[PDB]
Amino acid sequence: KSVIRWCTISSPEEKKCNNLRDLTQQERISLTCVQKATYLDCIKAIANNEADAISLDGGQAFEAGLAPYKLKPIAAEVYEHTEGSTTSYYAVAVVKKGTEFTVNDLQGKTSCHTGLGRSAGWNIPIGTLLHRGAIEWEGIESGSVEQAVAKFFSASCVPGATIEQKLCRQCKGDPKTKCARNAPYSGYSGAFHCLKDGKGDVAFVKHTTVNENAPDQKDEYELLCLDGSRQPVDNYKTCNWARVAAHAVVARDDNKVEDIWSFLSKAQSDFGVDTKSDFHLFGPPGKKDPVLKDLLFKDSAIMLKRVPSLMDSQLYLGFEYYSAIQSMRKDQLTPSPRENRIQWCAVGKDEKSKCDRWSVVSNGDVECTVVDETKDCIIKIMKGEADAVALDGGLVYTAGVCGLVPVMAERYDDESQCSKTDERPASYFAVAVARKDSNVNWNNLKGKKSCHTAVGRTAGWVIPMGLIHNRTGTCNFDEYFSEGCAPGSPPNSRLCQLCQGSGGIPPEKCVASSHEKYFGYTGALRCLVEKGDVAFIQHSTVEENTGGKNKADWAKNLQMDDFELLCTDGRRANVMDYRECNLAEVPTHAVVVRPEKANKIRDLLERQEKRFGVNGSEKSKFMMFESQNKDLLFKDLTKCLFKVREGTTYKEFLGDKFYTVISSLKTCNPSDILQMCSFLEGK
Numbered sequence: 001k002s003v004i005r006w007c008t009i010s011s012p013e014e015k016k017c018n019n020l021r022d023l024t025q026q027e028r029i030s031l032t033c034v035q036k037a038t039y040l041d042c043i044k045a046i047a048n049n050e051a052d053a054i055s056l057d058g059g060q061a062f063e064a065g066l067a068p069y070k071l072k073p074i075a076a077e078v079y080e081h082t083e084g085s086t087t088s089y090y091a092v093a094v095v096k097k098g099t100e101f102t103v104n105d106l107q108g109k110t111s112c113h114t115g116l117g118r119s120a121g122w123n124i125p126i127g128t129l130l131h132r133g134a135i136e137w138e139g140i141e142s143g144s145v146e147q148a149v150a151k152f153f154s155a156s157c158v159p160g161a162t163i164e165q166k167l168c169r170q171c172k173g174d175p176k177t178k179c180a181r182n183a184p185y186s187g188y189s190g191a192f193h194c195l196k197d198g199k200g201d202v203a204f205v206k207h208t209t210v211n212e213n214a215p216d217q218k219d220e221y222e223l224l225c226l227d228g229s230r231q232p233v234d235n236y237k238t239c240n241w242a243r244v245a246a247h248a249v250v251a252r253d254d255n256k257v258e259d260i261w262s263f264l265s266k267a268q269s270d271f272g273v274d275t276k277s278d279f280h281l282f283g284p285p286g287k288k289d290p291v292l293k294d295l296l297f298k299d300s301a302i303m304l305k306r307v308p309s310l311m312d313s314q315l316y317l318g319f320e321y322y323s324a325i326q327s328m329r330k331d332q333l334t335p336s337p338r339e340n341r342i343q344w345c346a347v348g349k350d351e352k353s354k355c356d357r358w359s360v361v362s363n364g365d366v367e368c369t370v371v372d373e374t375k376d377c378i379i380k381i382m383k384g385e386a387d388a389v390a391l392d393g394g395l396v397y398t399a400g401v402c403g404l405v406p407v408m409a410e411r412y413d414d415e416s417q418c419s420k421t422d423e424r425p426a427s428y429f430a431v432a433v434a435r436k437d438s439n440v441n442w443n444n445l446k447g448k449k450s451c452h453t454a455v456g457r458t459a460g461w462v463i464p465m466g467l468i469h470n471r472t473g474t475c476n477f478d479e480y481f482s483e484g485c486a487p488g489s490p491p492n493s494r495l496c497q498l499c500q501g502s503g504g505i506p507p508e509k510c511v512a513s514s515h516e517k518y519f520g521y522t523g524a525l526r527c528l529v530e531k532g533d534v535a536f537i538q539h540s541t542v543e544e545n546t547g548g549k550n551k552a553d554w555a556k557n558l559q560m561d562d563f564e565l566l567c568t569d570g571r572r573a574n575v576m577d578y579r580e581c582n583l584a585e586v587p588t589h590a591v592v593v594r595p596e597k598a599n600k601i602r603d604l605l606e607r608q609e610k611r612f613g614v615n616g617s618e619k620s621k622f623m624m625f626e627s628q629n630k631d632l633l634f635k636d637l638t639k640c641l642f643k644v645r646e647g648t649t650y651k652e653f654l655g656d657k658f659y660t661v662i663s664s665l666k667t668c669n670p671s672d673i674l675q676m677c678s679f680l681e682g683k
C-alpha cells in the first residue's frame, strides 16, 4: 500500500513510533519510522522527500515554513480547557513556593528552559524579558540573544544552546550530551525537574507542566505573574505569559497530505484518549521519567484537529507571535520605512491601475498590491503584507471572522456628513429592478432570468437569496431561476449561463472581479438590460447608469422609466420610490484592518481623502471615489469616509438584523478562507 513516513527525534521517540507502526500495518494507509538527530534534520528530510511528517512546537512550525522547507501545518494538537478545549496553550514561569523574588528580581537567578527556540520554553520568556527591558538587547547587532540571556541569569539549562557556555551549566547529564534537545532536562517536564532539583530558581513551561510532573506537590510551587505577583499553579489563566498555537504536524504541500490525515485520523480513534489499547498516541500524562514524556505528541494533547488547506504556518502562529520570533532574528533600528504609507489591496487589472494612479498621486503615501480573488486581500492584511481594503457589507463579515476590524466606512448621503453627530445612521438599500413593458413581478421570478452583482455581496446576493433561504428554508440557490448571472458563482451552472466573461485571451466568465462584464452593481444592471429579466442591486444603480451618467454602447441611451422596482411583495414602483419599495436597508461598505493598525491608516486615510475626496485639494489630479461606473477600490456613490469609533467590532458595524442573515446564510457553504479563520478564531 502506501506507508506514511514519520520522522522522529530520539531513541525513545523512535521506539514509540515503531511500536505504533507494527499496529498500523493492516490499515489502509500504513506507517513507517525515520529517526534523525534534531527536529531540524527531520524538516530537511520531509522536504527532501525522505520523510513525510513530524509534530513541531510553534517556534519550530515557524522554521518548517521558512524556505527552502516551506512545510505546511496539516494537523493541530488539541488541549483540555474549560472554555472549550482548542488548539492552544499557556506559557508560565514556575518557581518554588517560599522563595520571595518577583518576576522583577529574575536577574541574577538561575533558570531552566525546555529547548532553545521553543515557545513556552524560550520564545515567550526571553522575548517578554527583552520586551520588559529586564534583559538588554536591541538587536542581533548588540550581540547574540544567548549572550544576553546568559548575562541576565547566573546559570541556566537551555537544551539546544551552543553559543553561550553558561546556558548549559545547570543541565544534568553527560558532559558531552547534557545540553541536547532530548537531554534529561529538556522539554516541559525536563525543565520542571531542573527547577525541582534546585538547579534553577525558575522553570519556563506550559500551564500543565507542574500537573504532569508533580500533582500532589503543587502547593510547593507558585507561578511568577507578570504584574509582579505570585499565584498558585492553578491560576494560569489569570497568570501566564502568553497563549500559543498548539504543536502541529507539518508536511509537504502535495497530494499526500490528504492521505496522512487518514493515517492520523484512524490512528486517533484506535489509540486516542478514550482508547482501551495498552498503547497510547497521547501520553498519557502524569508523573514519570522525563525521558518518556512528550514522545511524537505531547502527553497533554487529547486530539488532532485537521487544519484547513488554506493554512500556512505564518497564518497559524498569528501576526503577533510570528513577528516576535522575527524580532529576535533581525535587528530593529532599520524599520521606519513601511509603517507610514498604507498598502492598499487592489483586486483585478482595473483596480490595480486605479490604485497605481493613487500610489503616484499620493507620492508614496500609498502603495498597492494586486490580487485576483477579493478574499486574497483579507489574507494579505492578516499577514501584514497588506494594510487595508474596502469591503462590501457581506465580506466585512468574513474579514471580521478573520480578525480584521472596520475602521472607516463610506457614506452615500452627502459629501458633508462624515463628521456628524445625531445624524449617525449610514446605509443604503437593496432593490429588485426590472423593465417597463416587463411582465415580471417579484412573485413571478419562479422561472425568470436574473442578474446578480457577485455572490456573497449585500445587495446582489445576501439580501436577495436571503429572502429565498428564509422563504424556501433551503440552501440550494442555483435552481430558482431558469438562468441568470452572479460572478464568483459555479462556472458550470444556470447562474453563470447568462454571464458574459472577460471577452478575450483566457475566458474569465463568472469571475468575481471587474474582469467579468456583469460583475458589480452596474454590471448586473447591464445583464438586466441585455440578457435577463431581473437585476438585484443598489438603490441608486439605475440612476447611475441612466441620464448620460454612462456612455457605454448600451446605457448610452437608457432612461429610468424603461425600468421599474420590484416591491418586496405585490407591485412595482418608480425607481425613485425605493425608500418605500426595497428588499432591505443595509450596512455601508467599509475599510478593514488589523486592530493594531487602526490608529495609523485611519489617520493616513484622513490625510489622503483630504487631498482626493469629493471636494478635496487635488481632486483634479485624482479622485478616490470615481471609476467609470465600475466601483474601483471604493463605490462611486461614496461622498466621503467616516471614522468608525475606536473599538467597534465587525458585528456591531454590520448591524444585527443584517449580521444575522450572513451568519446562517454563510453556513450553507463556507468559503475556504472562512474555514481557515474560524479555525484560528478559536474553533
Ligand SMILES: C[C@@H]1O[C@H](O)[C@@H](O)[C@H](O)[C@@H]1O
Pocket: 049, 050
Ligand atoms: C525513498 C524515496 O521515497 C520517494 O518518495 C520516492 O519517490 C523515491 O523512490 C525515493 O526512494
Ligand SMILES: [Fe+3]
Pocket: 057, 058, 118, 119, 120, 121, 247
Ligand atoms: Fe511548545
Ligand SMILES: [Fe+3]
Pocket: 392, 393, 457, 458, 459, 589
Ligand atoms: Fe454592497
